[PDB]
Amino acid sequence: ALLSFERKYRVPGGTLVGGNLFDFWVGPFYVGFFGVATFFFAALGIILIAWSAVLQGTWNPQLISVYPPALEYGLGGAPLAKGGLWQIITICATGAFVSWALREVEICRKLGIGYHIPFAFAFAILAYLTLVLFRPVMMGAWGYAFPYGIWTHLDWVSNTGYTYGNFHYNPAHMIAISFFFTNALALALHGALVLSAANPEKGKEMRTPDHEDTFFRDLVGYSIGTLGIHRLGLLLSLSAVFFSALCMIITGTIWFDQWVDWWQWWVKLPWWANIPGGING
Amino acid sequence: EYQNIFSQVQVRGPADLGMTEDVNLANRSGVGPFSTLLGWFGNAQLGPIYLGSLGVLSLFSGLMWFFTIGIWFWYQAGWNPAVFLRDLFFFSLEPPAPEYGLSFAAPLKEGGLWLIASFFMFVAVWSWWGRTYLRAQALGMGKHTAWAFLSAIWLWMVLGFIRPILMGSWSEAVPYGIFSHLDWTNNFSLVHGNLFYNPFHGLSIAFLGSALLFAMHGATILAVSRFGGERELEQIADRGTAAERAALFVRWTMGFNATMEGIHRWAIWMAVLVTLTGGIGILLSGTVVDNWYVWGQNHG
Amino acid sequence: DLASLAIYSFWIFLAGLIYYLQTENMREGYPLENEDGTPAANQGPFPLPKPKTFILPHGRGTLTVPGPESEDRPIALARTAVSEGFPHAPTGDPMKDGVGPASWVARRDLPELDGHGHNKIKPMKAAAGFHVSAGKNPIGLPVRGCDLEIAGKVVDIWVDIPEQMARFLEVELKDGSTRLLPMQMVKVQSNRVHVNALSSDLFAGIPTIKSPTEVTLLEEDKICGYVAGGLMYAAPKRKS
Ligand code: BCL
Ligand code: BCL
Ligand code: BCL
Ligand SMILES: CC[C@H]1c2cc3[nH]c4c(c3C)C(=O)[C@H](C(=O)OC)c4c3nc(cc4[nH]c(cc(n2)[C@@H]1C)c(C(C)=O)c4C)[C@@H](C)[C@@H]3CCC(=O)OC/C=C(\C)CCC[C@H](C)CCC[C@H](C)CCCC(C)C
Ligand SMILES: COC(C)(C)C/C=C/C(C)=C/C=C/C(C)=C/C=C/C(C)=C/C=C\C=C(C)\C=C\C=C(/C)CC/C=C(\C)CCC=C(C)C
Ligand SMILES: CCCCCCCCCCCC[N+](C)(C)[O-]
Ligand SMILES: CCCCCCCCCCCC[N+](C)(C)[O-]
Ligand SMILES: CCCCCCCCCCCC[N+](C)(C)[O-]
Numbered sequence: 107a108l109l110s111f112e113r114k115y116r117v118p119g120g121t122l123v124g125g126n127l128f129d130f131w132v133g134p135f136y137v138g139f140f141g142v143a144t145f146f147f148a149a150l151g152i153i154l155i156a157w158s159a160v161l162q163g164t165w166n167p168q169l170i171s172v173y174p175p176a177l178e179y180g181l182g183g184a185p186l187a188k189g190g191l192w193q194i195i196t197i198c199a200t201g202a203f204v205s206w207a208l209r210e211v212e213i214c215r216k217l218g219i220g221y222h223i224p225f226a227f228a229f230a231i232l233a234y235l236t237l238v239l240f241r242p243v244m245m246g247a248w249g250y251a252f253p254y255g256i257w258t259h260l261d262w263v264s265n266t267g268y269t270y271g272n273f274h275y276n277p278a279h280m281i282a283i284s285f286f287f288t289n290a291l292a293l294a295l296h297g298a299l300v301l302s303a304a305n306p307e308k309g310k311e312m313r314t315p316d317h318e319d320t321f322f323r324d325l326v327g328y329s330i331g332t333l334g335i336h337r338l339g340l341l342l343s344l345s346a347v348f349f350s351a352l353c354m355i356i357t358g359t360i361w362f363d364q365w366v367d368w369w370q371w372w373v374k375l376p377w378w379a380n381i382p383g384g385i386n387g
Numbered sequence: 388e389y390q391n392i393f394s395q396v397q398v399r400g401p402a403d404l405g406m407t408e409d410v411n412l413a414n415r416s417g418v419g420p421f422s423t424l425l426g427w428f429g430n431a432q433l434g435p436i437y438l439g440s441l442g443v444l445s446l447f448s449g450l451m452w453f454f455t456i457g458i459w460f461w462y463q464a465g466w467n468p469a470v471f472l473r474d475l476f477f478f479s480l481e482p483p484a485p486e487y488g489l490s491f492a493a494p495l496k497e498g499g500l501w502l503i504a505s506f507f508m509f510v511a512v513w514s515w516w517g518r519t520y521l522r523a524q525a526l527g528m529g530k531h532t533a534w535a536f537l538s539a540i541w542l543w544m545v546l547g548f549i550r551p552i553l554m555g556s557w558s559e560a561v562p563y564g565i566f567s568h569l570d571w572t573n574n575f576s577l578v579h580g581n582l583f584y585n586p587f588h589g590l591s592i593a594f595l596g597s598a599l600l601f602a603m604h605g606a607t608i609l610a611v612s613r614f615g616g617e618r619e620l621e622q623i624a625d626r627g628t629a630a631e632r633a634a635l636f637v638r639w640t641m642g643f644n645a646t647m648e649g650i651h652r653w654a655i656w657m658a659v660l661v662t663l664t665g666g667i668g669i670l671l672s673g674t675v676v677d678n679w680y681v682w683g684q685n686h687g
Numbered sequence: 688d689l690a691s692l693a694i695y696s697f698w699i700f701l702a703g704l705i706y707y708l709q710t711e712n713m714r715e716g717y718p719l720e721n722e723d724g725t726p727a728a729n730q731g732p733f734p735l736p737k738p739k740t741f742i743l744p745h746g747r748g749t750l751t752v753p754g755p756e757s758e759d760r761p762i763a764l765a766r767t768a769v770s771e772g773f774p775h776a777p778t779g780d781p782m783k784d785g786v787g788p789a790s791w792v793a794r795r796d797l798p799e800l801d802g803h804g805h806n807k808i809k810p811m812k813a814a815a816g817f818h819v820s821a822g823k824n825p826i827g828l829p830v831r832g833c834d835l836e837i838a839g840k841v842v843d844i845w846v847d848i849p850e851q852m853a854r855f856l857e858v859e860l861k862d863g864s865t866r867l868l869p870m871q872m873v874k875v876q877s878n879r880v881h882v883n884a885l886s887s888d889l890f891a892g893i894p895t896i897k898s899p900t901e902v903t904l905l906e907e908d909k910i911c912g913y914v915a916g917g918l919m920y921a922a923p924k925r926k927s
């Protein structure tokens with residue numbers, strides 16, 4: 107059905123590909139050419155995921171796992187049962203994700219709005235492709251990519267992390283961690299501030315943005331603003347994911363020893379590498 | 388096209404002393420300067436801050452904590468600046484030995500100093516918490532910030548206070564150091580058998596969720612700032628085309644709906660649930676559950 | 688055991704929370720309608736929430752939501768198919784008519800006020816103490832359309848006073864009248880302001896305001912909606 111204000115917005119046009127051919131809705135969902143592609147790659151992927159689960163022997167969703175080729179195949183193709191399906195699913199997964207982002211661009215064009223959302227999304231498509239494509243290719247094998255399985259993708263994280271000692275010491279990991287923590291701080295605050303103005307003390311009239319800006323200033327001496335806080339959230343989360351892909355692209359490629367030891371560059375700086383005392387020497 | 392990530396032109400007027408309501412105006416600083424640097428991203432006005440009894444208590448108490456730690460870092464450095472700067476990430480102020488259990492008898496040089504710095508942090512944070520409830524109350528606003536803040540306080544209290552007491556010694560608490568608090572984290576997970584099998588860890592991950600939500604939300608309000616959608620409160624009281632088209636992106640893309648106020652309820656809860664669940668995951672770790680791998684094998 | 692108890696208790700709380708959160712995002716746009724405006728059969732799984740009421744500051748009434756929903760304006764569209772789910776073609780000029788990317792909402796024909804009860808947006812000529820502090824001052828600059836033709840010139844900046852930001856460009860058209868252009872929809876350049884969304888002939892089309900020193904919530908939507916709509920509808924006259 108339709109939102110009470112929605113009919114006036116469902117005008118033709120804005121499509122990127124195919125004109126009026128797929129310019130329609132199914133229920134609340136806008137289709138478009140790229141709606142069709144998404145559903146295609148999704149349906150394909152799901153089919154192969156269910157297939158893979160047949161060759162594996164289990165229908166339990168907590169055990170289905172699709173594994174990348176062995177390291178022995180390097181970057182070539184592998185038999186479906188011994189690595190090929192991950193290769194296809196990964197193609198479909200990418201299909202579905204890129205079609206999803208393009209489909210959002212079409213929705214943006216119809217609505218007359220900015221493309222900030224599909225732009226932001228693409229940073230996540232970026233991270234995924236880092237893990238399953240850029241890092242493996244640069245390392246010389248698809249075996250270095252994570253497997254599609256609920257708990258088995260978590261075992262990949264432990265074993266990859268622990269190959270380099272405590273992964274905490276990856277300097278880019280550190281920064282990435284920070285942006286993730288701060289984004290959450292920032293969200294909790296924005297969410298609380300809007301709502302504390304919209305829903306004031308009982309019986310009081312709605313506060314204004316003026317009250318919003320006064321609150322932050324009273325509390326920490328500075329208020330970023332109402333446009334600024336949205337600029338800041340978009341920016342914190344995009345950087346968080348950006349440094350994530352960066353922390354993983356350098357791991358195993360340019361740096362492959364233990365991350366804790368990378369920090370010796372600082373301790374061994376020549377003007378103090380040898381003063382005794384402290385922890386080092 | 389123009390993307391609205393940085394302001395194009397900056398206007399300035401007289402410094403804004405702010406809404407009065409029931410605030411005690413005798414506790415606001417002079418307006419600080421104006422950062423044209425900051426002006427491209429957000430507001431350019433620094434100050435005025437509000438400092439009263441609790442604000443000083445907090446600020447003072449929090450510096451005391453900060454110094455007690457940093458003193459120790461000079462003791463470890465042999466009072467040598469070169470060393471200090473070299474091993475900065477490596478110094479660490481550690482909790483009392485296990486022997487001292489929960490007593491306050493530990494020598495200064497063996498976690499008596501930790502206990503002092505902890506006490507100061509305990510005053511500073513709880514002071515600051517009462518500060519966030521009272522700054523809102525004086526403006527007539529709901530206390531959503533104090534309650535959301537209480538969620539982070541929850542995790543911190545479990546980590547350094549509630550769980551140590553439940554375990555029976557201060558040694559279970561987090562030390563004060565850069566690299567050393569990192570190793571406590573790795574250590575904790577190993578001892579309890581992979582925190583990855585702690586189901587509360589896993590949800591706390593899912594909520595950390597907030598990157599996605601605030602990516603989407605920030606992206607949207609920018610996408611609809613051509614209709615002044617950043618003005619969210621008056622879009623709540625009198626829905627305009629910004630709120631209508633932002634609802635329709637959500638609805639046409641993935642099928643459900645978000646109101647202008649509604650999405651901030653989504654936002655505050657996504658965020659608070661990170662530390663709310665996480666505190667439960669740590670609290671149960673070692674007090675109730677010794678090995679999360681072993682636990683997941685029976686679910687009991 | 689005790690941890691298993693903690694985790695079912697949580698998943699139950701979470702289900703109640705999702706339900707709460709879900710019904711809160713139904714206070715606007717519901718009940719669902721058919722394309723002909725009558726109430727849709729299937730309204731979805733959750734019910735409507737108990738109506739909450741805002742008290743608008745400055746004695747401006749209240750708002751109870753959810754409340755009765757009408758567009759309070761005429762919609763110049765028509766069906767293009769015989770079944771639900773298809774687009775609705777404009778029956779006139781979609782920018783003149785205010786449909787599609789050019790839609791506006793019938794908001795209160797009142798200006799938004801600041802917390803002290805004053806107009807929130809004032810032309811800078813009439814907002815004391817305000818000036819351009821960094822960046823290029825657009826006042827004096829000529830305004831250019833997406834057909835690379837000059838449509839007018841900037842004669843003032845309309846400024847948010849409590850938030851201290853630019854909001855509109857008062858562009859003086861060639862007949863001597865002005866219009867407001869959203870700040871978010873122009874590119875201030877070193878020798879010109881550039882408007883990709885409107886060709887030069889559609890500038891006189893921009894909705895005009897009544898009081899020369901103030902702009903209402905309605906006038907804001909009609910202007911921003913018109914300028915945004917040109918992105919789609921002015922495309923037959925644009926290069927790059
Ligand atoms: C033993 C484990 C190691 C460790 C090993 C690793 C390893 C190994 C990696 C990380 C990475 C990360 N770690 Mg670490 N890390 C540890 C400790 C921590 C701690 C902590 C408190 O100690 C924290 C907070 C983090 C935090 C983080 C982030 C910086 C980053 C994960 C986010 C990310 O990449 O998003 C990016 C998001 C995505 C890729 C998802 C994209 C989603 C796609 C595009 C869309 C999917 C749609 C879906 C299919 C649709 C289905 C839904 C419906 C059906 C429609 N690490 C310890 C020390 N960490 C990871 C990273 O940076 O990856 C690049 C990584 O690989
Ligand atoms: C990001 C860095 C690491 C990584 C490390 C971790 C760690 C560590 C954890 C998870 C957790 C999860 N991860 Mg993983 N994960 C990565 C990449 C992925 C990708 C991907 C790139 O395609 C996907 C789809 C998932 C999926 C998931 C879920 C099983 C779960 C909750 C995520 C969540 O809430 O996100 C935030 C998103 C939302 C709140 C939006 C809703 C998303 C829904 C739930 C997606 C469901 C996916 C569905 C099960 C996948 C198949 C659908 C297909 C149609 C068949 N991960 C990489 C390898 N992931 C947690 C868990 O509980 O695992 C058991 C956990 O602790
Ligand atoms: C090798 C290490 C272990 C591990 C061990 C732990 C441990 C141990 C903990 C976590 C915790 C967390 N882990 Mg884990 N974790 C691992 C793997 C991961 C991975 C991954 C591989 O991708 C990820 C993404 C995460 C993610 C996370 C977060 C979801 C969670 C912290 C929430 C938070 O915001 O804390 C940061 C926020 C706070 C600490 C709250 C701070 C509030 C106080 C009041 C702030 C005071 C500031 C003070 C006053 C300073 C003032 C500064 C100036 C004034 C500016 N873990 C592996 C398995 N993880 C925590 C958790 O909840 O677990 C369930 C936790 O305790
Ligand atoms: C860049 C900052 C953060 C971000 C932002 C972001 N996410 C977004 C967007 C944005 C801006 C959207 O607009 C888009 C959206 O529509 O959101 C509602 C999206 C979205 N982010 C999603 C998920 C998601 N985002 C994540 C992360 C992030 N999103 C970042 C942290 C994660 C994490 C943290 O891991 C997940 C799981 C979806 C809800 C949605 C994209 C939906 C989509 O692409 O649909 C098309 C695809 C399908 C319907 C299914 C295809 C199935 C495959 C063919 C088979 C499965 C293959 C897969 C590899 C199996 C893997 C399973 C195992 C790992 C368990
Ligand atoms: C030269 O520079 C000078 C010396 C001038 C100043 C510099 C100082 C420096 C170098 C400071 C460095 C500080 C650092 C590195 C701090 C790092 C802190 C970290 C990483 C903290 C992480 C976690 C802390 C936690 C979880 C603490 C929790 C504590 C509590 C919950 C408090 C509980 C209180 C207790 C146990 C005692 C309370 C006692 C009573 C009686 C109530
Ligand atoms: C980000 C925190 C900024 C805090 C701002 C506080 C600035 C106040 C400066 C005091 C002003 C008094 N005087 C005489 C200098 O004008
Ligand atoms: C934490 C906030 C930091 C804000 C950083 C300042 C960014 C400056 C961007 C300037 C770009 C504007 N300019 C000059 C191109 O018009
Ligand atoms: C406030 C919205 C809640 C969205 C819920 C996200 C669900 C993610 C599921 C995480 C799986 C947890 N677990 C126990 C299986 O590990």
Ligand SMILES: [Cl-]
Nearest residue numbers: 341344345348
């Ligand atoms: Cl970036």
Ligand SMILES: [Fe+3]
Nearest residue numbers: 296300608619
């Ligand atoms: Fe917002």
